[PDB]
Amino acid sequence: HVLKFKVDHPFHFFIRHNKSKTILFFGRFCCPV
């Protein structure tokens, strides 16, 4: 059965250039607006 991945509470996120594995942007989202 399908895995639930519900992003409805604080998380870390980053945008990566995959070949080099360089993190271009990093953040934590914990507080809407």
């Binding site: 519900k6 992003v7 409805d8 870390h12 934590r28 914990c30």
Partner: protein, 352 residues
């Protein structure tokens, strides 16, 4: 053999590793004060600007910067930055990714020609003479206009009146812009208003995007979290999301994760052999963040101190020992929606 290719890939790996280590160190420092706030930054932009500054640094000023920014394992960190910059700026038609650097210098202040040629070589930074002495506002505005152009008009006023002064002699600026569609886009039809839980006792509405599709997922049962990779077009870039299994503490639910966060851990999780393609019911908020900060105090708390004092040694760019970093302004923006993501940032290292 291709020792040239092998060397340059090692160079790039050094800078990527430095940026990863610096990302976690910086976040951990920012988090000490701001435990309950959104944080968003481009470690690429911050490190690039400070690397262009490091190029001019000497003695303990340089050694401190190298330690904080994690440049220690590199014989020529500037080469790795060059090669990464070239890779990011490579011409393409499937998405937007670009980064640029620039040197703004007091027209009366002479810089060493070696610094300028190396800055051009490694960072593609050209010098622009400006009148800081008797025209700070005109100089500030032209800088903000360049940054506006590099950021697709998302960062319109990087520097404020308090930042640029008559005493300002040099401003080293990096900008980065990214915009790409998801490999698989969300259908706006399936987006609905749902609660986002800030804590066990607090929630606010967000537009929650939804799709059912297959993504790489790492399930870390014993540390109560999951991580997902969300590829952009052709999977050349991705957004990674690290999500605790629930809110199992008295604040954000991230206390344990943030306590145990290291780049070693982050890195091995992101590329884990156990992160495999999984059919997922994915709910992701449509969200945007903006942030602006003077990193001076933060960087001093991390161990970069001398550069911000009268004993600062930037004799890589000048024969006079009369320069010191006054401010490190960083501004960032990101917007996540059904089509993809737009992300952009700039860093100004202000030297007096």
């Amino acid at each position: 053999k291709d020792r040239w290719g092998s060397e340059l890939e090692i160079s790039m790996e050094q800078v990527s590793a430095s940026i990863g280590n610096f990302t976690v160190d910086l976040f951990n420092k920012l988090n000490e004060t701001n435990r309950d706030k959104n944080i968003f930054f481009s470690p690429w932009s911050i490190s690039s600007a400070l690397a262009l500054t490091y190029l001019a640094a000497k003695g303990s000023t340089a050694r401190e910067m190298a330690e904080v920014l994690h440049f220690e394992q590199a014989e020529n960190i500037h080469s790795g930055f060059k090669e990464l910059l070239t890779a990011f700026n490579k011409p393409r038609n499937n998405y937007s990714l670009r980064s640029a650097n620039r040197i703004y210098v007091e027209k009366t202040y002479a810089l060493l020609p070696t610094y300028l040629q190396l800055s051009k070589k490694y960072y593609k930074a050209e010098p622009q003479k400006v009148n800081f002495k008797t025209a700070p506002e005109q100089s500030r505005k032209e800088i903000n206009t360049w940054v506006e152009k590099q950021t697709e008009s998302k960062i319109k006023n990087l520097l404020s009146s308090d930042d640029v002064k008559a005493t300002t002699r040099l401003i080293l600026v990096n900008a980065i812009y990214f915009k790409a569609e998801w490999e698989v886009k969300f259908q706006a039809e399936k987006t609905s208003i749902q609660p986002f839980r800030l804590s066990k006792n607090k929630s606010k509405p967000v537009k929650m995007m939804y799709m059912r599709d297959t993504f790489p997922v790492l399930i870390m049962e014993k540390m109560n979290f999951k991580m997902i990779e969300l590829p952009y077009v052709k999977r050349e870039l991705s957004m990674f999301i690290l999500l605790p299994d629930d809110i199992k503490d008295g604040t954000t639910g991230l206390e344990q994760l943030e306590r145990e966060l290291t780049y070693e851990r982050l890195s091995e999780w992101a590329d884990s052999k156990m992160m495999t393609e999984t059919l997922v019911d994915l709910h992701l908020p449509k969200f945007s963040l903006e942030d602006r900060i003077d990193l001076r105090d933060t960087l001093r708390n991390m161990g970069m101190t001398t550069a911000f004092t009268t004993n600062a040694d930037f004799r890589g760019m000048t024969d006079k020992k009369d320069l010191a970093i006054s401010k490190v302004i960083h501004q960032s923006f990101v917007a996540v929606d059904e089509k993809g993501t737009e992300a952009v940032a700039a860093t100004a290292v202000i030297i007096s």
